[PDB]
Amino acid sequence: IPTNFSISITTEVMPVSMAKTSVDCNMYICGDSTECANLLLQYGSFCTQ
Amino acid sequence: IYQTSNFRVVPSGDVVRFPNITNLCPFGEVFNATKFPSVYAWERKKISNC
Known about the structure:
This is part of a larger assembly, with 2 copies of chain A.
Chain A: H1 25-28, H2 34-43
């Protein structure tokens, strides 16, 4: 049977959020080539999905 | 809120800034001389990369 107590305080770290990233495929795909967009629009909604 | 499309600024002007002139031609110097040969002994100077 214990006779004395010991009040302790522990810590616990848990992530709840991350980096809200947003990549624009208009600049990533077809950076500056104006003729590149004509072929990029041929694929479809890969920049929308 | 519903994302629809993207936007981009269209370039209006254009900057064709080029480095200042390089190897200058000695044309400015061939017209400024104190002596010149005769007609039958004309000198043929080769000028290139100017």
